[PDB]
């Protein structure tokens, strides 16, 4: 949920794979500043001498891109006290 006056903000988390199986849980302590998501389509257009032909092949590989800054002031961690540079 976003801050909507009904629930408090909940920030993004990355769950990386662990060498021996199972997973990490890297959660961001400041959320991104820019967040962009692209959804390209594989549709192509060819122009015949007397008509246009529209052809589609379905959904294409989506792209996720986002940008942000790690906080400055120290913030407690679920198993430590880690600063922004350590994060």
């Amino acid at each position: 949920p976003q801050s909507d006056g009904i629930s408090n903000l909940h920030r993004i988390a990355l769950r990386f794979p662990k060498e021996g199986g199972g997973y990490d849980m890297y959660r961001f302590k400041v959320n991104p500043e820019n967040y962009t998501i692209d959804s390209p389509q594989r549709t192509t257009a060819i122009k015949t001498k007397s008509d246009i032909v529209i052809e589609d092949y379905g959904k294409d590989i989506e792209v996720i891109n986002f940008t942000g800054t790690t906080g400055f002031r120290p913030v407690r961690e679920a198993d430590g006290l880690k600063t922004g540079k350590q994060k």
Partner: protein, 139 residues
């Protein structure tokens, strides 16, 4: 009322010192600071998460009636033309007149500008707007 027994600084009880020497006929000594504070905004909430510092900025302005000798050029602080490159870090203090005890120091300064005015039936003045690295104090 009494000097030792008041508990606010009047301009009476403050000396202004610079290059280890008291100044005659100084007027104002305004010291302004900006720590460029601008907290991180964050998509998903309306309000800043923490307020954080982005660049120190320190200005001290001194204004003075122009004395016939020992003006800020004669005391060596101010200068005209290229000669400024020969100058070095000037040093400034604010002191208790009643005990000669430092209130604060400005531990490294340089001039921005050296404004001057002559006017009809008026007293001439120097003005200097120094920039400075840091300010500190002990005792």
């Amino acid at each position: 009322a009494s000097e030792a027994k008041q508990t606010v600084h009047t301009g009476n009880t403050v000396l202004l010192m610079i290059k280890g020497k008291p100044v005659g006929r100084a007027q104002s000594a305004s010291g302004q600071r900006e720590y460029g504070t601008t907290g991180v905004y964050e998509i998903g909430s309306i309000m800043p998460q923490e307020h954080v510092y982005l660049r120190y900025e320190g200005t001290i302005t001194v204004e003075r009636l122009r004395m016939k000798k020992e003006n800020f050029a004669d005391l060596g602080y101010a200068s005209l033309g290229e000669e400024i490159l020969k100058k070095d870090i000037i040093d400034i203090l604010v002191v208790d007149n009643l005990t000669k005890q430092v209130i604060i120091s400005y531990h490294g300064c340089s001039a921005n500008n050296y404004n001057e005015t002559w006017q009809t039936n008026e007293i001439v003045t120097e003005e200097i707007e120094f920039s400075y690295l840091t300010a500190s104090d002990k005792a």
